[PDB]
């Protein structure tokens, strides 16, 4: 398939590069993160990707406790990104990196990126760290409501990307570093953060918000029925502040991408849960090979009409292209 | 469908009853359900095509008793009670053992006692154990539990790894959201990861004949299993965990999942295309779930009639050697 | 779900009533007749009780397609269409109409479609397969040359054409000899209709009129499941197909066809169709009065698909297709 | 996947070679002929390169079923079976065989089946639909009374019966008039075979002989997708069906049939079948030489199913069905 849109495609700046064992692989990953116009573009051309919505790597800004430096790095990353997109505006779009450890500053940088730089959304690597940085700051908290109101005003999607939990909140993985990251930890962290947003009633207050989750929903689709329907015989209203069910907000305010989850069975389950209209193609480059994502998607077992929507038209619609 | 086998069916004894809402008329009903075995439960089984019910103590129960002596005491009592209840109707009730795993040796002894002397057909443990001050979750992939697993394999009976909530110090991500703890989500995360720890530790290389059972359709594992092994596939460097093979291998070869508290056809279809119908078992999670809810859904779920028979009955019959 | 649109919903006029006599046992004949003749009363109460806002009505089968005499066919067609317009006018907020066409006379059929659409406001046409004319011994399929002008007018008026089933003529039914239970909805209807659809595709009709919209009931008359094979059988033979059409069957099916759930309330079938043609091209329908409205609605309300798709298949796809 | 078993794999003898002539263009005819006559070379090399350990061979179509003279049919069947036995004996660790039967003569077909199974070690029979006999103008379906003795023997011998396709006779093909491209594997084959199978079910054959194992290729010739409708159409009519069989079509399909992936390398189709008849009754097959072995194998090795089912469908279901363990 040609003319695809991919939106979990990362890059890095020298300042955040270290955020991502010794050898040829680490060397290649660094080159990939810093490259935009050469290797990346050539692969896009060879693998039917017309539009790539770029985002800074992780955890990047979310792991910078000093709000002052966080704002500085965010602005720096966004300016570099703007410069890179300007070189091939027909191929590259961008997500804003935000210094959410400072709500007001984050709201202001998002406005700058959207109104001044033409960015089409924001991508945040989970909870923020601030001050001593020992407390994970989730976005369902009161201090972030103004920010969400502005996100809804600008009407641009918010991509809730993964990050690892803090060491003190990772005991379950002690002795198992291989379970952290993309293997599992990433999904758990992001799925719950997403659930917190839903449970908080955020989408009752701002129903037009568009949240995006990669890796096919971080496991949410398969368990969505249980999330709401467990112990169904208990006919008492849910205790959380949100007015409706998790499935309602997930179906109405979320979109999921195929980033790093090239599995047909998983895609079928998702199509039968959230629907093809809310699934978007993405690769997770440079952490995943573009050819791997594209070859799989070009041949996955779905209707051709859905391959067109998932690979291109859903995104073009979502980002008003 | 008639003649079904259900195996995540709970009961409680006065000592563990409190572990199991609000002041609402629901708490009263739940209590009655947990304490009942021969009456209400049996009538529902007769009304909903369930011939065999493999009973297990509630949660967290024994896993939440930090004092070894006490844990060993409560477990033995819960197992003696269970043994007595099953003896009243051996043609309908089977049993899973409650184990005081905060004491590896005592747990091994009690499992042997239950299996060899009481005829229990397996064990059901509610996640990690608490011991001493009870501030450290004790996972079963740890070295001290290897002798135990060797005995489990020797006795050749399944181990049902059931959920429990993580300790508060390990649940900050849920702070302010108590509604996310329990069956809503926390149970799955806790159990899925414990299962992965067992896999990564190489436990199944050492004891390949082990049979582990997970409820709630695998605690989310099937949907993400491909990613668990294949994420960042371009990096051809070998994984550094002790296990010799991949997660999917151990999941496909040493695990079975049940339909407990997850009556969703889409989820069942995904599981069928991931682990296979031969590895899926009907279960309800009674009394936390209504038996009629579980049965009505399963009787009509969109699968092959041949698979409805296997998932609803024959897979469990074979697994627990009920035909011979 | 409320506000659904159903479009394979039949009625009959005295002149065509007997055509449905041989499709149900004698004990059910009186009831089927009542249903076929009723539009304003019981039918509407069933619609209200089962969340159906719009019902696009059509004459029963084979009706006009089984009238060998051109003059008579044109007469009955106009009559049925006039009656249908009368009934819709009684409840214009709930009923829409498909035209009955005397296709044994191409020109007359073209004229009648124009009258129905431009003058009566009908939203499409429903034809029960091939037509009989003259001695009525030869099935007349619509891929034939003489029907090209008609198709050009269908595309110009831009209204869908519902290719409905009918049984094959006796001389073309020997495979069912001794098995009358295989004729009709059991199987013969699907074969007859699926092949007729393939004939239209293979003839290149959609190359000439790419904007045509064809609708098939009973989930595509079996087409989705075998569509890959229809084009890809013997793929090693790298030569172009021998038929007139310039492209593949899958292209025309994917681009010019829509299928409904009439008389095929099977979740597995719906899932296969979703993964072959997509939810955007599947429409809810019941096949009342040959199928119970509650059977269709109850199944569709609970089938295992995304809620977003239940809304599309149940309502918005049809509203989009018929420009409502 | 290695060690696969494939069971809709054809070959031909000079006497039946021309039967496959019209099914392929002119330039590809030479290649197809080579493939049909080859068993020990090209075929074996493809099996070794594409993980196929066992190939259950069968004569091409329509072959014997299109020979109206009983005597000639009996001769051709026997000749074809002897050649096949000869070929299998060259590499018995890789090749097994399906008997060709002269069903235009019930008693003769019964005797030949016995000969192939008892004396030649054949593991079943493959018949290309209805038979033609005498004037050959009447399709003879196997649900007819004269074939009951035959079926009784099939059940006694306890070997599967592969109901393979064939095109209907011209007078029974008017729906395809003007569309020769709709005959054969494109569609006519499936319609013809699906209905023949339904006739067997409706006749009550499986009530009388419940241990029969019937096999259909091309993923059930379309049956799985419409199976619910076949039994449940017009469900509001609460009156039993009119056919002589005691139960439902779905019951006989679920209990007496097995389907193969021959010439239908489609994942969506396989998923539907898995949810209708179950993975335990789906078997890998290619339809070589009409389909490329690599096409079938590459698709099956990667299709979206549980690895445990890939093993069953690709090998163990067949080994179990043909008692190879
Ligand atoms: O997608 C990512 O952002 C990512 C990382 O940031 C680190 C490792 C793997 C990975 O997929
Ligand atoms: O053990 C369970 O399965 C359970 C509980 O112990 C408490 C709430 C829900 C539940 O499913
Ligand atoms: O027109 C129909 O839809 C129909 C019949 O005409 C006869 C039986 C069943 C049926 O669905
Ligand atoms: O016998 C077959 O299987 C066959 C043919 O005889 C002709 C074309 C395709 C095909 O699969
Ligand atoms: Zn990423
Ligand atoms: Zn439980
Ligand atoms: Zn109809
Ligand atoms: Zn064949």
């Amino acid at each position: 398939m040609q003319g695809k849109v991919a939106l979990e495609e990362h890059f890095a700046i020298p300042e955040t590069l270290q955020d991502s064992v010794p050898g040829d692989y680490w060397k290649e990953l660094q080159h990939r993160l810093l490259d935009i116009q050469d290797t990346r573009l050539k692969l896009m051309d060879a693998h039917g990707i017309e539009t790539m919505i770029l985002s800074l790597n992780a955890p990047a800004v979310q792991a910078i406790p000093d709000r002052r430096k966080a704002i500085e790095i965010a602005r720096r990353a966004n300016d570099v990104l703007a410069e890179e997109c300007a070189k091939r505006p027909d191929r590259f779009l961008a997500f804003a990196a935000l210094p959410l450890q400072d709500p007001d500053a984050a709201t202001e940088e998002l406005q700058r990126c959207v109104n001044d730089l033409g960015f089409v959304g924001a991508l945040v690597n989970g909870f923020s760290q601030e001050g001593d940085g020992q407390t994970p700051l989730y976005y369902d908290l009161p201090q972030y409501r103004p920010f969400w109101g502005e996100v809804e005003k600008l009407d641009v999607p918010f991509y809730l990307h993964p990050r690892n939990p803090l060491p003190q909140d990772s005991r379950i993985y002690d002795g198992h570093p291989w379970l952290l990251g993309p293997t599992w930890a990433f999904a758990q962290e992001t799925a719950v953060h997403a659930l917190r947003l839903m449970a908080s009633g955020l989408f009752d207050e701002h129903p037009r918000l568009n949240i995006i989750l990669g890796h096919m929903g971080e496991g949410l689709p398969y368990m969505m029925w249980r999330i709401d329907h467990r112990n169904a015989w208990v006919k008492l209203p849910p205790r959380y502040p949100a007015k409706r069910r998790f499935m309602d907000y997930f179906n109405e305010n979320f979109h999921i991408t195929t980033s790093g989850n090239f599995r047909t069975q998983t895609l079928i389950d998702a199509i039968l849960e959230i629907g093809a209209d809310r699934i978007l193609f993405s690769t997770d480059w440079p952490f995943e090979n573009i050819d791997h994502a594209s070859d799989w998607f070009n041949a996955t077992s779905i209707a051709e009409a859905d391959r067109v929507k998932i690979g291109r038209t859903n995104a073009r619609r979502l980002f008003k292209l």
Side-chain angles (χ1 to χ4, degrees), chain A residues 1-18 20-152 154-321:
Chain A
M1 181 183 166
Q2 301 298 298
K4 297 191 290 281
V5 175
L7 55 150
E8 185 174 332
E9 327 296 314
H10 309 290
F11 87 97
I13 51 174
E15 294 81 350
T16 66
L17 197 172
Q18 302 311 304
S20 303
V21 310
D24 52 356
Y25 283 103
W26 172 219
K27 182 182 180 185
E28 173 60 29
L29 178 53
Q30 297 182 63
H31 160 72
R32 294 185 175 189
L33 283 166
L34 297 179
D35 161 88
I36 302 299
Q37 313 303 322
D38 188 4
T39 307
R40 185 184 307 248
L41 192 53
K42 289 180 171 59
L43 285 171
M44 285 166 64
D45 283 347
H47 297 288
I49 296 178
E50 174 189 337
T51 308
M52 178 169 285
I53 309 185
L54 305 165
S55 60
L56 182 62
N57 62 319
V61 184
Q62 281 66 67
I64 303 179
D66 181 36
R67 56 179 52 180
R68 191 294 181 71
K69 198 187 75 175
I71 294 174
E72 182 180 298
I73 296 301
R75 286 176 130 282
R76 189 177 305 169
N78 289 327
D79 289 330
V80 172
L81 189 47
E83 292 184 302
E84 290 308 308
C85 289
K87 299 176 183 176
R88 278 304 292 277
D90 61 309
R91 311 299 295 290
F92 299 115
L93 292 179
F95 280 138
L98 307 177
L100 282 166
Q101 30 282 100
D102 187 310
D104 302 317
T107 298
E108 282 167 41
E109 178 64 352
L110 181 59
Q111 297 174 302
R112 185 179 75 91
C113 292
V114 177
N115 302 314
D116 290 16
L117 307 182
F119 285 18
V120 298
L123 184 146
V124 175
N125 304 308
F127 67 80
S128 295
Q129 277 178 278
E130 191 282 313
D132 55 38
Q134 299 306 299
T135 303
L137 302 176
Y138 293 92
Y139 309 132
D140 55 294
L141 297 175
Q143 61 264 49
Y144 294 97
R145 284 305 209 265
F147 167 71
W148 286 115
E150 188 56 40
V151 171
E152 182 178 56
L154 296 168
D155 186 37
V156 296
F158 184 102
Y159 203 122
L160 181 58
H161 190 271
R163 74 162 294 166
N164 276 320
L166 299 178
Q168 51 269 56
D169 304 306
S170 306
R171 275 215 297 185
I172 192 168
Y173 308 111
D174 284 352
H176 294 271
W178 38 77
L179 293 183
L180 287 173
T183 296
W184 185 275
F186 273 2
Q188 152 67 3
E189 178 62 51
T190 311
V192 177
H193 195 158
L195 291 177
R196 288 180 58 115
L197 299 181
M198 294 183 236
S200 71
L202 174 64
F203 305 110
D204 288 321
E205 296 161 48
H206 301 292
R208 290 179 291 120
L209 287 175
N210 281 303
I211 309 296
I212 305 176
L213 298 174
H215 320 105
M216 290 302 275
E218 311 294 0
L220 290 171
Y222 185 90
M223 301 295 274
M224 189 52 60
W225 180 87
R226 179 172 166 69
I227 292 175
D228 281 316
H229 307 272
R230 74 292 182 284
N231 318 306
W233 68 283
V234 175
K235 314 302 180 185
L236 289 179
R239 181 188 176 183
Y240 51 69
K243 297 286 172 292
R244 296 186 290 153
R245 305 162 305 183
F246 287 100
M247 63 171 277
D248 296 316
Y249 306 112
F250 188 62
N251 293 338
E252 293 169 31
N253 299 91
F254 288 68
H255 304 259
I256 67 178
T257 80
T258 66
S259 64
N261 210 328
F262 316 138
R263 186 62 162 179
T264 299
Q265 290 93 316
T266 299
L267 175 58
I268 292 173
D269 189 23
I271 283 174
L272 297 176
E273 285 291 1
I274 194 176
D277 295 345
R278 282 175 177 273
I279 303 178
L280 318 169
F281 171 75
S282 280
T283 77
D284 211 355
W285 169 263
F287 303 105
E288 297 288 355
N289 268 19
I290 291 177
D291 64 304
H292 287 187
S294 183
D295 288 338
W296 164 74
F297 185 69
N298 292 345
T300 191
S301 311
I302 62 178
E304 291 311 321
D306 286 343
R307 198 190 306 294
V308 170
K309 295 191 300 187
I310 296 171
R312 171 192 178 82
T313 64
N314 283 347
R316 292 189 67 72
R317 183 189 307 292
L318 181 60
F319 297 94
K320 307 178 181 59
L321 303 186

